[PDB]
Design a protein around this ligand. Structure first.
Ligand SMILES: [Li+]
Ligand SMILES: [Mg+2]
Length: 583
């Protein structure tokens, strides 16, 4: 009437506690003992989990118990080139166009966001890999205060907001952005969950938060820059470096090329000079962009177009003539005094200079007589070639119904997106937002291989010395004498797997359960178990007649798993073993 508190694994020598089996009660004394906990009873091993426990007392007086045995496996990704850890930065477009309503409720932001979450999970299925996330639009959505410039101007470039929803003075906006970024590379399980909680699932509505709606354009350059900065300062050559970029549009903002109006050469020469600093002459160094300022003061574009404007006059919507702003009567006096160029109640509207074709002379406003930057793709591609291509990062780009709106042709747009990927084949434009994840997964598969932890594995379960395996007829082992089921709802029926999603036997296809009458050993053969694939074996046992009183007997001899019985026959994991006794 005394109990052993615990026993010992034969593969690692570490202890496992033995609890009491409740249903085995003979008034305040216990007849059987289970290992680990009184619940699921799992033992974690490098290939997954395994348990072996009495789940049922069949007949207490006669010592008849029901053993349950379970095996659950794992998956990882190992990187094809030389088990090298990855450092991965996801770039996610969260522009207004990504709103779930848009493109006939195509659910861009939701679907993209979920693709990213899935990819982040797969990536981090390898404890070693690291992830970081940058969500962007007019700026990086990282939970800090940001400013953007908006509006139009009169003929002397005095700025006004011409929208009837805003005061005319509202020509910059300032807001705290949503925190949709995680800007340190991390592999910490908790930090990764935080990172996942920051992946946007929606974008702004024009009549939702109208302020943040002003920050919903596409500044692809700032994002690319941020991915580069994270890798450059946080990664190493120890690690392989990947960038996945999910986007729904061509850039509509960009950093300016730092043309210099005060030196005496053609802007085309200044340009050729920027390029000549680079081995391949394909790009412009960071030092030659205007970066060191506040975005609203220095950037080009405001979300309006991929194009910068030759004609500085705002045209009428679907028309040719110059748009004009009817001044409200109660504001005529004030705008006049302020200095606006008012022509009999109306202000004629020009694009603000940040949207003009450039360079142009700061004094005379005259456009360059030579080189002209006419799009936001050009400078973005130049920055990319100049500062990112060199580093050799693998760069995949999944576009979502990219077509060039606003201001690019579909062809112009495909070229741009190719130009900001590692190879031409590293950009794919999907026509349907359910393919977003397939596409991200193809590319990732390029770099990694999925490996299930249990490949042709074997369980060996010999009965303990005082134990009788129960046979329904006392003589022959039959398929009626054990039950094997998989957590995908498949089962061995008469030694043939049936069930699971494809009516093919699932998880249990070609698995077999065999028995050796002599050694009294039950075996599971041919297990192939990935992540969250689990198999459960139940059978019946009886304690043999020749037993010694109040002495706990083991239910099995050494019970083991061989996770890969071909790939590493020597890898052998122990199962915990219950114990029983009677008088
Ligand atoms: Li039988
Ligand atoms: Mg967009």
């Amino acid at each position: 009437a005394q109990y052993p508190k615990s026993a010992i694994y034969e593969d690692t020598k570490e202890n496992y506690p033995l609890v009491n089996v409740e249903g085995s009660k003979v008034g305040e004394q216990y007849k059987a003992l289970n290992p680990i906990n009184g619940k699921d009873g799992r033992r974690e091993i490098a290939e997954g989990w395994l348990s072996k426990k009495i789940t049922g007392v069949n007949d207490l007086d006669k010592n008849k118990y029901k053993i349950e045995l379970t095996v659950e496996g794992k998956t990882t990704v190992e990187t094809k080139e030389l088990n090298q850890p990855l450092d991965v930065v996801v770039l996610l477009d969260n522009s207004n166009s990504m709103n779930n309503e848009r493109a006939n409720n195509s659910q861009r932001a939701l679907k993209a966001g979920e693709a990213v979450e899935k990819l982040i999970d797969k990536i981090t299925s390898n404890k070693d890999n690291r992830v970081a996330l940058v969500t962007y639009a007019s700026t990086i959505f990282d939970g800090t205060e940001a400013t953007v410039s908006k509006g139009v101007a009169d003929q002397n470039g005095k700025a006004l907001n011409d929208s009837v929803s805003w005061d005319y003075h509202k020509t910059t906006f300032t807001a705290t952005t949503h925190n949709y970024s995680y800007l340190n590379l991390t592999n910490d399980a908790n930090e990764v969950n935080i990172l996942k909680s920051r992946i946007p699932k929606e974008a702004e509505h024009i009549n939702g938060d109208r302020t943040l709606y002003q920050f919903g354009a596409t500044f692809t350059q700032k994002a690319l820059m941020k991915a580069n900065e994270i890798l450059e300062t946080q990664s190493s050559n120890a690690r392989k470096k990947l960038i996945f970029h999910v986007t729904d549009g061509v850039p509509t903002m960009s950093y300016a090329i730092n043309f210099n109006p005060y030196i005496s050469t053609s802007y085309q020469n200044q340009f050729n000079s920027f390029l000549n600093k680079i081995p391949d002459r394909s790009g412009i160094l960071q030092e030659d962009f205007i970066i060191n300022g506040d975005d609203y003061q220095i950037v080009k574009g405001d979300g309006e177009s991929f194009k910068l404007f030759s004609d500085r006059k705002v045209p009428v919507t679907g028309g040719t003539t110059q748009a004009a702003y009817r001044v409200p009567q109660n504001q005529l006096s004030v705008m006049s005094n302020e200095g606006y160029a008012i022509n009999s109640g109306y202000i004629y509207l020009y694009w603000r200079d940040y949207n003009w074709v450039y360079p142009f002379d700061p004094k005379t406003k005259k456009v360059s007589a030579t080189k002209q930057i006419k799009t936001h793709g050009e400078p973005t591609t130049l920055y990319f070639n100049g500062n990112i291509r060199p580093k050799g990062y693998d760069i995949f780009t999944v576009g979502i119904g990219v077509n060039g709106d606003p201001g690019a042709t579909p062809l112009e747009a495909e070229k741009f997106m190719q130009s900001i990927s590692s190879k031409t084949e590293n950009y794919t434009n999907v026509d349907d937002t359910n393919k977003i994840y397939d596409e991200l997964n193809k590319y990732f598969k390029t770099i990694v291989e999925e490996k299930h932890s249990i490949v042709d594995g074997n369980v060996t379960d010999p009965m303990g010395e005082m134990i009788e395996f129960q046979l329904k007829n006392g003589q022959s082992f039959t398929h009626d004498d054990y039950v094997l089921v998989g957590n995908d709802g498949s089962q061995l029926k008469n030694g043939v797997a049936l069930g699971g999603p494809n009516s093919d036997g699932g998880i249990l296809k070609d698995v077999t359960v065999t028995y050796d009458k002599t050694s009294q050993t039950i075996k599971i053969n041919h297990l192939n178990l990935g992540s969250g694939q689990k198999v459960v074996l139940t059978y019946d046992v009886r304690l043999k007649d020749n037993y010694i009183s109040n002495k706990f007997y083991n239910t099995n001899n050494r019970t083991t798993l061989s996770p890969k019985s071909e790939k590493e026959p020597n890898t052998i994991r122990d199962f915990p073993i219950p114990k029983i006794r009677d008088v």
